Amino acid sequence: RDFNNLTKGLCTINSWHIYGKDNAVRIGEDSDVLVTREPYVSCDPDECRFYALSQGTTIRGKHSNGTIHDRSQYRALISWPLSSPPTVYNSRVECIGWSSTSCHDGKTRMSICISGPNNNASAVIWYNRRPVTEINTWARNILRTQESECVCHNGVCPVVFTDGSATGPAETRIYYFKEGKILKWEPLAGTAKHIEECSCYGERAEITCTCRDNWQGSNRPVIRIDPVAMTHTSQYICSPVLTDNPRPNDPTVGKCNDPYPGNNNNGVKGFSYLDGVNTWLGRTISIASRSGYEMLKVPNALTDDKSKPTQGQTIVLNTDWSGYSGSFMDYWAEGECYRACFYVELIRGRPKEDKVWWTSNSIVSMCSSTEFLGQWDWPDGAKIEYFL
Amino acid sequence: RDFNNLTKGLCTINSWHIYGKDNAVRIGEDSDVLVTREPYVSCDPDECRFYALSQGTTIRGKHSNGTIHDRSQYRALISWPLSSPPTVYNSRVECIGWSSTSCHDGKTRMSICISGPNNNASAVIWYNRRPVTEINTWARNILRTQESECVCHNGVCPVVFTDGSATGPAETRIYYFKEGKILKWEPLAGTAKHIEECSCYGERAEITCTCRDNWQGSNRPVIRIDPVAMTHTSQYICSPVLTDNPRPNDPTVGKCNDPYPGNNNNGVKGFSYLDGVNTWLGRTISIASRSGYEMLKVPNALTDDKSKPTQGQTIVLNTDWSGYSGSFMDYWAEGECYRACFYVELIRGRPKEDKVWWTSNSIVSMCSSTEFLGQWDWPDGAKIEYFL
Amino acid sequence: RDFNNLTKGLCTINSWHIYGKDNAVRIGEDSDVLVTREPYVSCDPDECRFYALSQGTTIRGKHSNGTIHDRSQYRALISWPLSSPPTVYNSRVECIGWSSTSCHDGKTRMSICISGPNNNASAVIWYNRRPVTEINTWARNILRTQESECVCHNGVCPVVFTDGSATGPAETRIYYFKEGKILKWEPLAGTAKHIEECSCYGERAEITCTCRDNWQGSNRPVIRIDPVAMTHTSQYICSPVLTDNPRPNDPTVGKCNDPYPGNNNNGVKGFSYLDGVNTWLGRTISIASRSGYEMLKVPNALTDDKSKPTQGQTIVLNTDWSGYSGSFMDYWAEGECYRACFYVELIRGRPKEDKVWWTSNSIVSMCSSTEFLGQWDWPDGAKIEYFL
Amino acid sequence: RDFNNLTKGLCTINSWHIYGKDNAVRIGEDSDVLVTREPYVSCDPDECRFYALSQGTTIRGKHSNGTIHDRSQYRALISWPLSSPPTVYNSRVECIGWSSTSCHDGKTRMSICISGPNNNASAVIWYNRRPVTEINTWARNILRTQESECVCHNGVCPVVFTDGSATGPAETRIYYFKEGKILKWEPLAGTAKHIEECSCYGERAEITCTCRDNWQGSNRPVIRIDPVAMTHTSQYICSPVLTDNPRPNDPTVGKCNDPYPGNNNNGVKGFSYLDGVNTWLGRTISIASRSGYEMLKVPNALTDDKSKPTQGQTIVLNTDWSGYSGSFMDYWAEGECYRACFYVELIRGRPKEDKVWWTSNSIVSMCSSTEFLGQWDWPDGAKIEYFL
Numbered sequence A, B, C, D: 001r002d003f004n005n006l007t008k009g010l011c012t013i014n015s016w017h018i019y020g021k022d023n024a025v026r027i028g029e030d031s032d033v034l035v036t037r038e039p040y041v042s043c044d045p046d047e048c049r050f051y052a053l054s055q056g057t058t059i060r061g062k063h064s065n066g067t068i069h070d071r072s073q074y075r076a077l078i079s080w081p082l083s084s085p086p087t088v089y090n091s092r093v094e095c096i097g098w099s100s101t102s103c104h105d106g107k108t109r110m111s112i113c114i115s116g117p118n119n120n121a122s123a124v125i126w127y128n129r130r131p132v133t134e135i136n137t138w139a140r141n142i143l144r145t146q147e148s149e150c151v152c153h154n155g156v157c158p159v160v161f162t163d164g165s166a167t168g169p170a171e172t173r174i175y176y177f178k179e180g181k182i183l184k185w186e187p188l189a190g191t192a193k194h195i196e197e198c199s200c201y202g203e204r205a206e207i208t209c210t211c212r213d214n215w216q217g218s219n220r221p222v223i224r225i226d227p228v229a230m231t232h233t234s235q236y237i238c239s240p241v242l243t244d245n246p247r248p249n250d251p252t253v254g255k256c257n258d259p260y261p262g263n264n265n266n267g268v269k270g271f272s273y274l275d276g277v278n279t280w281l282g283r284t285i286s287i288a289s290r291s292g293y294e295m296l297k298v299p300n301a302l303t304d305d306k307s308k309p310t311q312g313q314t315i316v317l318n319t320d321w322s323g324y325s326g327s328f329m330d331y332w333a334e335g336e337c338y339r340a341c342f343y344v345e346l347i348r349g350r351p352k353e354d355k356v357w358w359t360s361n362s363i364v365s366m367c368s369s370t371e372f373l374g375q376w377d378w379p380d381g382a383k384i385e386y387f388l
Ligand SMILES: *[C@@H]1O[C@H](CO)[C@@H](O[C@@H]2O[C@H](CO)[C@@H](O[C@@H]3O[C@H](CO[C@H]4O[C@H](CO[C@H]5O[C@H](CO)[C@@H](O)[C@H](O)[C@@H]5O)[C@@H](O)[C@H](O[C@H]5O[C@H](CO)[C@@H](O)[C@H](O)[C@@H]5O)[C@@H]4O)[C@@H](O)[C@H](O[C@H]4O[C@H](CO)[C@@H](O)[C@H](O)[C@@H]4O[C@H]4O[C@H](CO)[C@@H](O)[C@H](O)[C@@H]4O[C@H]4O[C@H](CO)[C@@H](O)[C@H](O)[C@@H]4O)[C@@H]3O)[C@H](O)[C@H]2NC(C)=O)[C@H](O)[C@H]1NC(C)=O
Pocket: A240, A241, A248, A249, A250, A285, A286, A287, A294, A295, A296, A308, A309, A310, A311, A312, A313, A314, A372, A373, A374, A375, B119, B120
């Protein structure tokens, strides 16, 4: 086993095909399914798995009451087989905490969980299923990380962390890990003014992350990382196709180097694939809430402040709930190019559906096709009324 | 690991012995068993497994209400250990969709799931548990495939798909796959006038499929495929022993090159083994409904339009429900010949048993014996009244 | 991997230590535990497992009603990890039927299940988890076999079957299998007048089985088998310490070559270790019912028609239910001798406890010690009243 | 695989990071979680697992009634994946009994369970998942052992047992095992006057155990073992920071060679790391009950009868229940030093919470960091009222 290297480009994305779906809320209506949120997908060389933050109770369990809260001592990063639900009996605990990331470097897996109180959180970096490095909070304000997979190149796996205000300037750092040890870290550079929850992918020896400016931006910040030099910059997606949520209506011209204004102090984790004409952006269909989800092909979105969609695909109808969304690729598939993939978290329960006392989610995930495939929509599918 | 080659003939079939049975509806009365239908069996070189289409809910779960429907976003091909039930906790998802096939080529497994709306369905072809090829609907009318295992020879695994009307001419294609990639495809040839749900087996470098003419035929169409030349023809089973359902009474003479008339627009998936005097046909015992199941030895059924049974074996009594039935063989068993096997789906719930709001099934499977074994009957065994 | 050979003698048995216990009825009061009976234990070279006949329903399930019956289409030989309970989710199906045996030959496992109606039963012999040989009923009267493990020597695994009356002369055969194929079979020889449910062990190239004379004997028949010559004889245990159940009071003198009279048409599966002075017999404590269980050291029991106990060990109190009991050894342990082991089935429910509608069991198993260990008793431990 | 050797020293302990937490009582409110107590953690070369004594019933099960009792026939040492709960379906039985220890020697695992009545208990020593050696009670008074992992060095794995009074002099022995066989045993030596439940760790070819003087001491006895010479001594922790429970208030001066008085006939299993200035002691926060848990850095605690804390870390608040606590290390981690770890048992139910009829626990475990990490508290998290 050698470290994996990012030697391929992205396949041409002409549509999205179904990859995985776990139906966890439907099935967990009458089986021992854990309450989760903040899910993602990540591949090893011989298997791809679903990941999420457990809340340490099943959904039918009485302890599901109160699970709208983000951060407790009962949370852990869990993983489980692709498209199965996260059950008590099949879920494997990666580490303990309420913010995470995880990636395989070709030889073994690194998993990072942050736990603690808001003013005293710490990250523990696990490598080959043992704890190796720990990092203490630097700004004493909810140390937090990507909530989707990291990416490695020749052993170097950069990770984006943020510590500080959600509604003001914060202190974002890029840590470059290798075998779980810190090679280097840098403070955020470039023009992004606030960073959270970066969604990353790797192609041709470069790692691109699409993040959430929680403070001011409804355009998404982008961090581009060179994992060999161990350097980065940041900017925003130029495109007037705005992809955060909540957000104002789309203008005609976006902003490349500043937050696009109109909504403050709020947002959602999301992603994009930024590859010249082969660029696809994800977003909720609603400008106001986490409902619906679409993919739009927006040629040169990253660099063209007037780019608009040339194609699209509905993933979730606007009459169905969505949530966080994020990128991953199977870096160990055969063939000449990396096939872009993503998941969407389908959040159920509170706050939008408050007749139940819980919040949970299921997962749908697609990967790209070079065909122009017909679309379906992929909702969570559970009837909240069955839980009453 | 080399690609497997079909180098043996069928063993002499003198009776059928019990192979597997999961009792899923009985057990799922009080355990976390998934609602399924469209089951089958398929072997790898070191294990044989049960397969089916999940409905993405357990049977006791409230979401089992409505599961008579064939096609939703909550379905997936799952597999699980032989004769265990498909539970939440032991079932492995192969791919997402509501029509499937799957086979191992000696090196690894190919699995194909079709999903989408009726006018916009697509097939995703997985190989070694990754998506490799996608195929879009060509007639915009419920693209669909075998619902039982495919067969490979030297890496080439043909698969029969149909897109178009269930009650009229449709567009059937034979795709020849290798490592998940399309080597070739051909439109249906020969005299079969409508094809659905082919049940296939392989012997001496030839693949024989027994299919369902949904439009006109109560005799079954047969497709014979040369996986080296990558060519095929089709005809019908000549025999007056008619094997679709519903069907008219058996005549005295069948038809070789046309549908045998008497029932329109309906049928059920079934199979046969067509091997000269060693020929056995499966069918429901009832001409009117999916009840009962028998095997009949009908020497030269394929080519003799007056052949009648010379032996038989009851599998399921006419007072018990049956359903789809299909062929598979363990191509990696030791010994001089391939032992024919089959399963019967035992459908419970709607529409015949409408005091419950669900539809599900369990599975019974037999393989052939060179002995003349005593027969038992093998019903589903659940009491519907326990579910009330 | 070579075939295992029986090259060691029995270790000196000076007491019995606890080996395994699954508590299945206790735990299955509130978890998805299958209804079983006819359990046993058998080792592979790298693992020892519990085996039993499932009834194809959980114990809390409504289908547990009626499970006092011995033979249905819903039964299967299952195995599961040592001292775990047989659950829906962890139990592996070996084959389908309502009478079984199973043993590992050093290279792989042979499992035999008999199914069918009383007048038309057949055995299917599985080897390396595939069906290899089938055998049809020869006397049309409930073809049946050991219900505990077989034993192999250099690939040859003899198995004792009986077909015919339970209350009269029957036709017992010894089949000698190798890789699942029949090398030879012989009709029962020697002085045993009726044989059922043989409990076997192997030492120094000879296999000894202790069986149940259901028709006349309260002393147990014994079959001694030479697996190299493929020959056998039979006699009874001479000892006046009578070990079947129900049974008369112990006399002073037993019988070597005839059934010891006093009880007709009834009995229970049991076992012994017959090794000169190192001989230990198992039996229920009650002469009238399956309650209690003890081991007695009865020097030369096999050949001495006046032998009485020189030591003993209570396994289950007379105020607790027992059931079938049987022998196995770990033939792949390190060391100079084979350590004798046994299990006792602890039957709960009907017919003795008829406030519940089911019958099931749990398992306790001990192996011998060369120390003189203190004894405990090992009851099932469940409160029937919790199930009301 | 070679036997592991204790060739490293302890890493510098500057704080404790979260390692694992199973939330078993929360999750077991509505899933099939076994009732346990006396948990611990132990690593193999490729995996670390949770261990505990099952009570042979789930917590929601009616048989959980009465589980405050320590010793029944329904108990077994079980292990399960790190931070998962001990469920029916994922728990592996190591051996049967109501007192245990377990450790891996680099080649395979040794597990020891004691069972029997109080006056007739015996230990069975399993090695490579087979029983190898048995030891009978020597003082006929509840033969008992560590309840946390043992430690091996070059194949030699010493184990501390005690047989005799809990409230008076007893007979403690140190057995030195290798491949499950007794190399040697010695009676307790040095100044410790009563020993129970030793918590052990190994560094630089020496094994240190921190035990419980149940009879007189609120300071903890310490046994230091040379596994090459196979010799030991014992003394007490000198420090006036007293670490048993219940206990008097901390004095100013402790005792090195006698029990520190003030509480008789009671105590709790606990541990320490004794490494010069790098010494950390665990204890309950309450002097009166098993509530709260803290770690205190007490330089030279072992040898300095006036040492007081120079740092600390809260693990569990005084308003939350704790229980037994114990040491383990991952001896197969990479790097230059062994990272100290520990777990705390979080006992729920009786006797403190007597509105429920059961007693169970969950587990939290930490390992040391060379950083000064922020602290959180880690309670069990279940609401007893949900169980009413
Ligand atoms: C079976 O399956 C297939 C495969 O999925 C289905 O076919 C798919 O059908 C879908 C849905 O109909 C299509 O998605 C839409 O794509 C269009 C883009 O394609 C159109 O526009 C292209 C570019 O045109 C522009 O470029 C230049 C400019 O100089 C010039 O050429 C041109 O005139 C124009 O200015 C055209 O090239 C393209 O045409 C080609 O393809 C056609 C096939 O569809 C064919 O018929 C043609 O002949 C031709 O060859 C086509 O015209 C997306 O724009 C659209 O996305 C917008 O609309 C949806 C609402 O439906 C919305 O949710 C999106 O957010 C977006 O609209 C919002 O954002 C815009 C950007 O800011 C903004 O302008 C809009 O006002 C709107 O904003 C409002 O809503 C948002 C979101 O709520 C909010 O944030 C804002 O603030 C504001 O409120 C869809 O993605 C697929 O591309 C198509 N796929 C394929 C391969 O064909 C098929 O239908 C199914 N079949 C059946 C039988 O069911």
